Design a protein around this ligand. Structure first.
Ligand code: MC3
Ligand code: MC3
Ligand code: MC3
Ligand code: MC3
Ligand code: MC3
Ligand code: MC3
Ligand code: MC3
Ligand code: MC3
Ligand code: MC3
Ligand code: MC3
Ligand code: MC3
Ligand code: MC3
Ligand code: MC3
Lengths: 194, 194, 194, 194, 194, 194
């Protein structure tokens, strides 16, 4: 998609953020947004086209793909990116507001300190939450075979998924990127406190 | 699509708007435009391609998809974005006109105050209206099965929709974003009055 | 498509135009160009792919789609945009030429006044003309069923169109946008005269 | 495609050219490049996909499409644009070279006059030539039916073309644009001579 | 594809190059890169999709397309562009290095002269080489029929190619462009020597 | 995909890097990123669409493509580019941090020297590693035939790959580019030490 607006906002965040925060933003842009655009979106292009079920029942493939993949992985990662980014926008807005107020009348202390720490907190929580949701929804291994018993499918039908190994690889890659982001938030807290 | 022109106009609106207004515009750009471009448009890519009806009647799938989905959701959201944005453009134009007039001769009071409040009002009305239209047209749950009795379909035919669960998720996501926009307009009114 | 060049020219037109003219250009960019790019072009993507005729005759679907839709709607709107825009480019060029001449030697009167009024006139005429052509070619309701008797089709065949309801909606939307443009040209004339 | 580089060069040409030349370049950008990108390329998207021949012979559709359409129209127009543009680049380069030489040492006369006139000449010749080639290759009406007798086709087979009416419309549109370009070159010559 | 980076580098090369070199770069950008992007890539879009073999043997079309077209033409031209461009980048880098060194301490002679001449030489060699490779691999006429005897094909099968005439036209066009580039390099050498 | 952000970061790296480093970055941008975008991604577009297995077993093609190509080549190259780039970003960040610190108070020595050398080291290791992984996973020749015995396939089935020769060519091209990158890192080390 088009991430230019968010790109500008997060560059401005880089202008006003800790070094570890800059590392976090660079990770976000290179290892998550870029990887989705260049690589992952082409793996999931034929997710439903190349999803094959051994049946002659109309509508069984559709409902079985819907049950196998309620939300697609790529979409889930998109939402994860947006949500983990939002706190940074909040902090950047607080900063610009204080700057405008100073200008009206006539560098991390007071409200900025607290707000930044809270930003860190929320980023961490959201990240952990998406990780856990991904685990409980799919785990971290996409098996080639999916057995479906949803109406209109007669008895249990066997269905086969496109590119399970490649998808598995990218699932783990993005999970590792998320864990790196968590480590970076922890390091930022430590740096602040000491 | 290409939202760059609107992007520039709404950035200019950010230059001249309340803090809560800036939050509203950031929500608009990140949670609605971006989500449509990156995520939702790929969910609805195969809306009619993967729409399957259990019949051998030529033309039944077409008329049954037309009856099930008169306007697509993504298109409806596009129109919603445009319409909720228009008032902001009107207010921005009023502002630039007053600036040009001052320049000819030789900061929210008088006409700007009223016009801004009215902008808020219209944004709210339009938002609520689209929400209600969405509800009365589709509700907020897209069932996998759609039973169609429209000519040329013989008797009632069963038809099956692509990605009902994912579409349901995104419907609710966008509804929640709209409700957040409403809360923001209310907060802006309150801030003005007090 | 790519409207950037025209975008720049019409922004320059905004630099030199009446307030109502600025409103007209904003309408052009937001409600016509943007709507086509984001929404309408995806409705008409499968116009011929999902056009189904109940026959086993080779070539009947092609000739029946050609007879049903001689020019596609989206293409017609593209041409409408270009043509209604041209006068504005003519006026902008007259303006830049006078500016260059002043520069050589060493704000709406004389030739600029007349030329601007004529621009208005032409914009109006073209708009009305496209509206009427659209009406006489298609009307403003796209029926799902189209009965075709063109060779090689044997006797009369029934053919079915993709997304008739959505297309009908967008037809009316664009017609209303055109009528708004007409009202704006009328208002601009009135403002000039008084 | 991507016409940005050529766009920049021809904008520079506008910086150094007659008023009628500026009109010519605006015509080139709006009525030929833009129309191809936004409209014509979508008419010819399914030129071979929706080309249907009434036969069961493998390879007959391919050779019959190749014989019906040796070069596609859109490609022919692309080449026409490039070739009619080249002279303008030559003149612009002559100009920049003279400017650089003046700079080394320490507004249409001499070499610039001749070179510009010759540019006009070549533009005219190329235009007329492409027009005539288009006529002799296709004429200006694309008939729906094409009868093909090329091996491997057995006896004569009937083949049917996609969107003949729409293609016919756009053929005539582009021909009229080319004739307007010719009129503009003639007017430029007249302006120079008088 | 995206040629913007290379575009910037070669514009910088234009800043520091002979007039004939500027002509060469303009040829490169307009007649080779642009033609590929706008025109040729759409001719070769369905190279394998519309490649039809008269057989019922699974896998024969794949191996016969692979034997007929080991490397596609468009890809070959892409590589040709890259390779003929590289020397220019080398010369530009030599230039910028000398400029930086002058800056540290505190216009074609010495090392720059030799390096530029060598650039010319390499460009010529590479060009000639690609031309000859194209000839020995395909010649300059793409016949519609290709007879294939590669396993798993039983005996010899007849296979038919998409758009042979159009491809033939573009092959010759690009060959002529390459010969023009050669003439330009020769002219540049002559200009230097005299 | 979209490499603009990385492009900016690596341009900044060029601002602060050795000449051989600049050559390395130019190689990265021209011979790896550009080649993937313009050429390789179109070779691997139909990797699974045109993958044909001689069987009537549902799901055998999917599992046999997954076993033949666990990760696609293009995706592997994408990851290779990202990883070999990361060290350069680390070094650039170290540099900008030292610059900011100098600014607070009031050119390759100390920490910058070590960090740069380590960057070189890591780039080399990663490169070699990806090379070896590519070899052990696929080798450097993609055979047309792949024999598959994975469930649900009955006994051993023959499967055929799209464009094996072209893919083989590009595999070797990218391997040679990687070896050139290795030579450049070695040359940079030598230049530093002497
Ligand atoms: C503010 C934070 C709010 C958090 C709210 C959490 C709400 C949790 C509701 C718990 C209801 C559980 C009941 C249930 O769900 O019924 C079981 C059903 C799965 O059925 P199954 O066991 O057969 O396996 C499924 C196999 N299949 C994947 C092929 C289908 O559904 C599942 O378990 C899938 C559950 C997926 C949960 C996704 C949570 C996303 C959290 C995002 C947080 C973002 C923070 C900003
Ligand atoms: C902003 C924070 C967002 C947090 C989002 C958390 C989303 C958790 C979704 C849980 C879905 C369970 C679905 C299920 O029912 O499938 C498991 C069953 O069998 C079982 O495992 C039964 C036990 C299930 C234990 C689930 C523990 C969830 C703890 C979440 C902690 C999040 C911390 C931020
Ligand atoms: C300035 C504001 C003007 C507002 C004008 C509102 C006009 C309301 C006209 C009321 C006519 C009702 C009669 C009717 O419509 O016949 C019923 C028919 C649905 O048939 P059904 O009951 O079988 O279920 C349908 C199930 N199916 C979805 C699968 C097809 O159609 C429906 O109800 C669908 C109705 C959808 C209404 C959409 C309203 C959009 C408002 C946008 C506001 C924007 C403000 C800027
Ligand atoms: C600028 C403002 C735009 C507002 C747009 C409002 C659009 C309302 C569309 C209503 C379509 C009804 C379709 C229908 O007939 O299907 C329901 C039936 O059965 C029933 O429910 C019969 C009772 C239906 C009650 C509908 C109440 C609509 C109230 C709209 C309030 C909007 C405030 C802004
Ligand atoms: C400078 C201005 C010049 C204006 C020139 C106007 C020329 C008018 C020529 C009049 C000839 C009428 C004879 C005729 O056309 O035979 C009837 C035939 C339709 O047959 P049908 O009755 O069975 O229904 C058709 C149903 N079907 C749509 C499914 C096919 O064709 C039609 O009526 C369709 C006619 C469509 C007219 C489109 C006019 C566009 C104007 C654009 C103006 C732009 C200004 C800048
Ligand atoms: C720059 C100005 C451009 C104007 C473009 C106007 C295009 C009009 C196309 C008319 C096509 C008629 C096709 C037809 O024959 O189908 C109707 C029959 O049956 C009938 O209706 C027979 C009576 C038809 C009356 C048509 C009146 C057209 C008035 C156009 C006025 C335009 C003012 C600008
Ligand atoms: C520097 C200027 C050089 C100009 C060189 C002109 C060379 C002319 C060669 C004359 C040879 C004629 C013999 C011939 O060609 O055999 C006839 C054959 C058509 O067979 P057919 O009669 O059955 O109808 C064809 C029906 N079908 C279209 C469905 C296939 O081919 C045709 O006539 C098609 C001929 C198409 C000519 C295209 C000329 C393009 C000029 C571009 C100028 C650009 C200037 C910068
Ligand atoms: C830079 C200038 C480029 C000019 C390009 C001109 C291209 C002409 C192509 C002619 C193809 C003829 C194909 C043919 O053989 O099909 C017609 C036969 O039956 C006949 O018509 C036999 C008589 C054919 C007369 C053709 C006259 C061509 C005059 C071209 C003048 C161009 C002036 C610039
Ligand atoms: C820049 C200067 C503008 C030039 C505009 C050129 C317009 C050319 C119109 C050509 C119509 C050809 C119809 C045709 O040869 O087909 C043949 C078919 C039998 O007859 C039919 O089926 C006829 C069915 C009805 C066709 C109605 C087409 C109206 C298109 C209006 C477009 C206006 C754009 C300005
Ligand atoms: C630094 C410069 C290094 C240059 C190295 C040149 C190496 C030449 C190796 C010579 C081996 C010849 C043996 C051979 O190849 O066996 C014959 C076989 C073709 O079989 P066939 O006769 O049946 O016809 C083929 C018909 N079919 C196209 C449908 C398949 O293959 C062919 O001849 C096709 C040969 C294609 C050669 C392409 C050379 C590209 C040069 C690029 C230079 C770039 C400079 C920067
Ligand atoms: C940087 C320089 C790159 C140069 C790249 C040259 C590539 C030459 C490829 C030759 C492939 C031959 C394939 C073949 O075996 O098919 C022809 C056989 O039957 C025959 O023709 C047997 C005689 C073949 C003579 C081939 C002469 C090649 C001369 C290349 C000169 C390049 C100068 C730069
Ligand atoms: C920090 C560095 C960590 C490096 C960790 C290396 C871990 C190595 C694990 C070794 C396990 C070997 C067991 C195994 O794998 O079972 C054999 C199985 C292949 O079965 P097969 O023999 O039948 O042939 C396969 C033919 N087929 C391609 C059509 C499927 O799998 C294979 O061998 C394929 C193995 C592919 C290895 C890819 C390594 C990528 C390294 C990237 C380094 C990036 C540095 C930043
Ligand atoms: C950051 C560094 C990343 C390094 C990544 C290295 C990845 C190596 C993957 C090895 C996969 C083996 C799969 C296999 O089992 O298939 C071969 C079997 O049969 C055999 O060959 C058995 C002997 C296999 C010897 C493999 C030697 C690997 C040496 C890697 C050195 C990397 C240096 C950086």
């Amino acid at each position: 998609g088009d991430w230019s607006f968010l790109g500008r906002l997060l560059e401005n965040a880089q202008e006003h953020s800790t070094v570890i925060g800059k590392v976090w933003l660079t990770v976000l842009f290179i290892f998550r947004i870029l990887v989705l655009g260049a690589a992952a979106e082409e793996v999931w292009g034929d997710e439903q086209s190349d999803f094959t079920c051994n049946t002659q029942q109309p509508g069984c493939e559709n409902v079985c793909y819907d049950r196998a993949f309620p939300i697609s992985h790529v979409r889930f990662w998109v939402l994860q990116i947006i949500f983990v980014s939002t706190p940074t926008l909040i902090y950047l807005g607080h900063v610009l507001h204080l700057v405008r107020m100073e200008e009206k009348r006539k560098r991390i202390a007071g409200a900025l300190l607290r707000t930044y720490v809270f930003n860190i907190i929320f980023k961490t929580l959201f990240e952990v939450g998406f990780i856990a949701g991904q685990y409980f929804l799919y785990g971290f291994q996409l098996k080639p075979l999916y057995r479906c018993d949803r109406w209109p499918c007669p008895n249990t039908v066997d269905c086969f998924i496109s590119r399970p190994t490649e998808k598995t690889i990218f699932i783990l890659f993005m999970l590792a990127v998320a864990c790196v982001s968590l480590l970076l938030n922890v390091l930022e807290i430590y740096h602040l406190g000491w």
